Amino acid sequence: HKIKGTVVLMPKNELEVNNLNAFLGRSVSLQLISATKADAHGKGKVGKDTFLEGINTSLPTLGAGESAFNIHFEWDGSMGIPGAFYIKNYMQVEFFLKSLTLEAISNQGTIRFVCNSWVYNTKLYKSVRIFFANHTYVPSETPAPLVEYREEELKSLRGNGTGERKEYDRIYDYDVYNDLGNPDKSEKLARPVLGGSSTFPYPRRGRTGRGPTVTDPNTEKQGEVFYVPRDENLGHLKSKDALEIGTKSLSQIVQPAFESAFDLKSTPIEFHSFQDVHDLYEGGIKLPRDVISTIIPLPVIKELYRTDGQHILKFPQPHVVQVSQSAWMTDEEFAREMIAGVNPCVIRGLEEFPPKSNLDPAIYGDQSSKITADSLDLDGYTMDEALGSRRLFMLDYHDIFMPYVRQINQLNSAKTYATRTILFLREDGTLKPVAIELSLPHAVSQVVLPAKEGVESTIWLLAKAYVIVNDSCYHQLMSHWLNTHAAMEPFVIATHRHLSVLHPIYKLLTPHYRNNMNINALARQSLINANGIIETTFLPSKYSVEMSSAVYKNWVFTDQALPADLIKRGVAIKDPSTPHGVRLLIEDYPYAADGLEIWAAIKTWVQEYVPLYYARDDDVKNDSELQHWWKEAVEKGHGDLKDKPWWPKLQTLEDLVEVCLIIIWIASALHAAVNFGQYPYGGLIMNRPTASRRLLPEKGTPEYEEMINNHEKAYLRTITSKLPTLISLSVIEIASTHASDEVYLGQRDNPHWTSDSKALQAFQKFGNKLKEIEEKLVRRNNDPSLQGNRLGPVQLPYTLLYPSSEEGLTFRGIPNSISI
Ligand SMILES: [Fe+2]
DSSP, rough: OEEEEEEEEHHHHHHHHGGGGGGSTTTTTEEEEEEEEEEEOEEEEEEOOOOOOOOOOOOOOTTOOEEEEEEEOOTTTTSEEEEEEEOOOOOESEEEEEEEEEEEETSSSSEEEEEEEEEEEEGGOOOOEEEEOOOOOGGGGGGHHHHHHHHHHHHHHHHSSOOOOOOOOOOEEOOOOOOOOOTTOOOOOOOOBSSSSSSSSSOOOEOOOOBBBBBBBEEEEOOOOOOOGGSSSSSOGGGOOGGGGHHHHHHIIIIIHHHHHHHHHSOSSSSSSSHHGGGGGOEEEEEOHHHHHHHHHHHHHGGGOOSSSSEEEEOOOOGGGOOOGGGGGGHHHHHHHHSSSSSOOOOOOOOOOSOOOSOOHHOOOOOOOOOOOOGGGOOOOHHHHHHHOOEEEEEEEEHHHHHHHHHHHSSSTTTOOOEEEEEOTTTSSSSEEEEEEEEEEOOOEEEOOOSSHHHHHHHHHHHHHHHHEEEHHHHHIIIIIIIIHHHHHHHHHHHHHHOTTTTTTHHHHHGGGGGGGHHHHHHHHHSSTTTTTTTTTSSTTHHHHHHHHHHHTTTGGGSSSSSHHHHHTTSSEEEESSTTEESSTTTTTTTHHHHHHHHHHHHHHHHHHHGGGGOSSHHHHOOHHHHHHHHHIIIIGGGGGTOTTTTTTOHHHHHHHHHHOOHHHIIIIIIIHTTTTTHHHEEEEEOOOOOOOOOOOOTTTTTHHHHHHHHHHHHHHHBHHHHHHHHHHHHHHTTOOOOOOOOBBTTOOOTSOOSSSHHHHHHHHHHHHHHHHHHHHHHHHTGGGGGHHHHTTOOOOOTTTTTTTSSEEEOOOOOOOOOO
């Protein structure tokens, strides 16, 4: 009556960022739980404590850091078929359980458990850790002897909403963004609570429970570690893959070290020519020994720079200068990066002229554009013909920036304009910028037109920089932080609270959450906190995160679907005669054209997976875990917007498909497209400035004369200063790196995630289509008719939506999740 089992675990030291015999004896007990035989109270019968017997060295399938143990369970004919197990760790040190495999049992001959969980000493847990077999069950199909265990494990994951969360807790719950300020250190570091009001609505984040500050009971006190539920806090076999901790080290160690060197006046405070900037990746920058000594031993940080270990630090050469050092300065590239750059999804089509503002004129005055139709060079078209043939588009930030420019322009080292850019689609299918409008409140507007000669060519170059400062802010805080990182976290929380590990939709979605809560927590601690990396390098300083709350007011879940976005922005129209059901108005638009192929692939996968478990609309309605999950994700997780009419109701098969498709799209391809191009395009600070420090010089001043004689200096005085540049380059270099243990779209981290062979086959064909799509995109980049937008004058093929990637700074590869 003995069942042979194999346990696979990883000792803690393998996964730490920096013998086996101790696991034998009576150090680790497992008890099997019956799926088919119940006790008096209807719960599956539990077997006896069984201990690890010996090491299994002759297991061929083991990966790095993994060890296997033999175990034998006495299990007689009264016990039935195992469907779960308890495990108790009596050691003092936690370990990472991977799997349990039982042999020669059940009609399938083998029962597989995939656990991937941290198991601490049984004393630290209020209830015993339980793990289920790899079957998939909607709630009403749960074997009756497991139903109660399923419900109790979910209760355990929800907690009660009280207490300070400890490292070993696995408790998922919501709180507002009240942990970014630090008013107990200084009132200067006070920040508004984001979330829970109509003024400052925001997605919720993971609750940590550290308790209130003394100066403000609405704000959470600081802590050395921002808690995440334990199995969200990913360990890695290689310390260099722990990218998420780099922002912490950059903020706490590296940044102070850089600041010291500059205050020392050992390095010049400012760039004085463009060559000073290019030197950063050619010969490097000389810094004091003390400062280099702080970098070279730090894991993760030590990979960002070449160094001789004493005085020289050198950044990698950014892709956007790999061929032409100057091409970024062309109007062609400026426009091309709005459809193929780091932030390719804000441009809008223009259907009337001039553009209008929606801001209240009683407060802001007339905000109607001062651009005149007759002033534009539209390659011979008239305005009427350009409008009617859908060849006018705008990159418009006026209404986003104008209600904040007064507050920003009062900061010491910040000056900005609210901008509008007009773009004309030429006959060759490339976009041409034809006007920039620079606005100030109280409104004052200057229109700048393209010029290649004279003083007006410098005013135009600077005007482009003010536009890109707007765009960089919007990219970092809205396109990137708000729309991917922050919008996704509530869905992660709700999924673990309300869908069992056994649930088919849990298995569909959870790979697309990998590392998301982890990076978000570390970001709240060191990236978007008061005086953190964003606040000290990007234009809006202390207003940065609140701006993203102002924009979240206009966030609509169903408008995150790629076809809906394209139609909403007026760059595509509905067309059922086309493959994707939408016709692009910029035909070669590289982000959208490739993205539609990825979107369609995900859609087929979701459409082939969901019907395996839901045959009719009523099955969706009658899934209580699914209904509670969606109710809480809307009413709590995105609860400041719970009264909007556009939320799906989750009453049909079609709704469930669309809800899961949008979530997967956001976590994978959308985040990839806006994230992994940051250093390739923005590693040159002149191409993607993060801040502007002055307004345009007035005629008759020294600054204006400087413009005439020394345009490179005029440009550098206006954009990001040298010291914040070094910090921002470092953080976007981290963000643009693929860890070697990344899981890419089309892959999973274990081949036994379900026992359902039909789901496995559907997942196999998904991965097969992704390979077909990659070949198609490779062909697009080699098509000479598409070079103008897919490569441009920088000659940088658009690879950001290729599915697969090796490790490193590759400018390709779509991860499953928001993992950095
Ligand atoms: Fe990211």
